[PDB]
Amino acid sequence: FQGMEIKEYENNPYHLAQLVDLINYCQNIEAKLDIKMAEQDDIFQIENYYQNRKGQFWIALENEKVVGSIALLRIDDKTAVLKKFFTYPKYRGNPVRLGRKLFERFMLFARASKFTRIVLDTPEKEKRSHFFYENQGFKQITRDELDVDYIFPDRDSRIYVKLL
Amino acid sequence: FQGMEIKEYENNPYHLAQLVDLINYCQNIEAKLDIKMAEQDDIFQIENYYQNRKGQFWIALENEKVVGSIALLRIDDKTAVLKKFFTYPKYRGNPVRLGRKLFERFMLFARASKFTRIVLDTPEKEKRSHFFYENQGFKQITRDELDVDYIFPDRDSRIYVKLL
Numbered sequence A, B: 001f002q003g004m005e006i007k008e009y010e011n012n013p014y015h016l017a018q019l020v021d022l023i024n025y026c027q028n029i030e031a032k033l034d035i036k037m038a039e040q041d042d043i044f045q046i047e048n049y050y051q052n053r054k055g056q057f058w059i060a061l062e063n064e065k066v067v068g069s070i071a072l073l074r075i076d077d078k079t080a081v082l083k084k085f086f087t088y089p090k091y092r093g094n095p096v097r098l099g100r101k102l103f104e105r106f107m108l109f110a111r112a113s114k115f116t117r118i119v120l121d122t123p124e125k126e127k128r129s130h131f132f133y134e135n136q137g138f139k140q141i142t143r144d145e146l147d148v149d150y151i152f153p154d155r156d157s158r159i160y161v162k163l164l
C-alpha cells in the first residue's frame, strides 16, 4: 500500500513514542482495558526481550509514523506467542488490511523458525478480533487445557491456537 | 519520608514504563489534556535531551516505583525551563510534600548551574498547580512579553517565571 512499510523494530525514540501512543489507544481509549505500561515493560526493552531471544517485533509505518505492530515471543523450539498486535482503525480491513499484512509477516518468521504452534490471548469482549483470528486459522482453547511455558495476563480473555 | 528517594534518571525500562504511566495519568486521566507521547518524545531520550545538554531529569521513587518527576532544560547560561513536573495525588501536600521536594531538588541544580531565570507553562485550568507555583515564588507573565529561546506548546496555558 502507498507510503507504507512493515519492518523489524530498531531503537528509535520517535517510533517508540508513537508505538506507546498506538498501544495506549487500542488498549485504553478504544477497548477501555485500563492496562498500564508497567504491566508490559517489554515495550521499553524490545531488543533484549524479543529480538535477542529468537523472537521478533515488527512495526508498520505509514509515512514513517507507527500505525501497527506485532511481535513474536519464543517459548521453546515448537511454541511461540503472538503479542502486541495493534493497528489504528482506518488501516483495518479493506483497503489496507494491515492486520493481515502484519499477521503474514509474523508467519514468514514463525515458519522459518520451525515453530509448530502459535498461541495468543484476546479479551473476551473483542468480537472483531476473534473473527479476525478465526479467519487467520486460529481455533479457541481452554486455559486449563493448554500446556505451555507461559502465563497469560489475569484478565477476562480467550486463548487461541494455530498449528503450523 | 519513609522508603522514598529522589534521584537523577538512569536508563531503566522498568522506571521508564512507570514514568510513562505517571505522565499519562496526570496529563490524560486526571487533567484530560489528551497529550500524546509523540508530542513529548524527549521522555524516550532523557540522557541526550536533558542530561547531555547541561539539563537534568529527576524521578521520585517510593519503594523503587516512580511516583514523581521533574526536569530542567537549559535554554542558555541564564535561562532554564522547568518541565515534566508530575506527582501522583497522594504524595501532594501534607504529609509528603513531594512537589515541594522535587521543586527543591530542581533548584539546588538550577542555582549551582548559575541560572538567573526559570520559566514554565501550566494549563489555564490547573488552579491547584498555579497556587503551588506562586507559593514557590513564581509570578505569571505574558507569552508575547517574555523573550526566551523556547516555544511553549500551543495549548491554553499560562507562563510563569521565577528570578533567582
Ligand SMILES: [Cl-]
Pocket (backbone or CB within 6 Å): A091, A092, A093, A096, A097, A098, A099, A100, A101
Ligand atoms: Cl486487517
Ligand SMILES: [Cl-]
Pocket (backbone or CB within 6 Å): B091, B092, B093, B096, B097, B098, B099, B100, B101
Ligand atoms: Cl507538594
